[PDB]
């Protein structure tokens, strides 16, 4: 197969609650996956969001995958990633 030590996050892109882009990132890259895939009007003063079980918070583009997954709590695979473009 192709098991990977690191983990991944499911990002949301486009006006829809069903289109998302998931990605496996190591603690090196940050919210580049969320913005790069969930981009459109060009990365200009944009931020990533984290909502899980009603727990929504503003996530910075410099938040490492797990880094962001460590703020939620025990349920690391219960959060959602979403691209917010003002």
The C-alpha angle 59, 14, 75, rounded to 5 degrees, equals: 40
Domain ranges of the chain: 1-86
Give dist(CA 23, CA 12) in Å, integer: 11
- Two structure tokens written together for 19: 């289109």
Closest residue by Cα to residue 71 from 81, 59, 82, 84: 59
Do 37 and 23 touch, CB atoms closer than 8 A? yes
Beta-bridge partner residues of 59: 48
Q: Please tell me the experimental approach by which this structure was elucidated.
A: NMR
- Note whether 65 and 10 are within 8 A (CB): no
Which token pair is 39?
Answer: 């981009």
Count the neighbouring beta carbons within 10 Å of the beta carbon of residue 14.
12
Pick the CATH number of 1-86 from 3.10.20.90, 2.40.50.90, 3.40.640.10, 3.40.50.2000: 3.10.20.90
C-beta of residue 27 within 8 angstroms of C-beta of residue 64: yes
**What is the rounded distance in angstroms from the CA atom of residue 6 to the CA atom of residue 8?**
7
């Amino acid at each position: 197969g192709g098991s990977m030590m690191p983990m991944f996050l499911t990002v949301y892109l486009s006006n829809n609650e069903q289109h998302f882009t998931e990605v496996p990132v190591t603690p090196e890259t940050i919210c580049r996956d969320v913005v790069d895939l969930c981009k459109e009007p060009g990365e200009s003063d944009c931020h990533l969001a984290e909502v899980w079980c009603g727990s929504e918070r503003p996530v910075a583009d410099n938040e490492r995958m797990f880094d962001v997954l460590q703020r939620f709590g025990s349920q690391r695979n219960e959060v959602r990633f979403f691209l917010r473009h003002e």
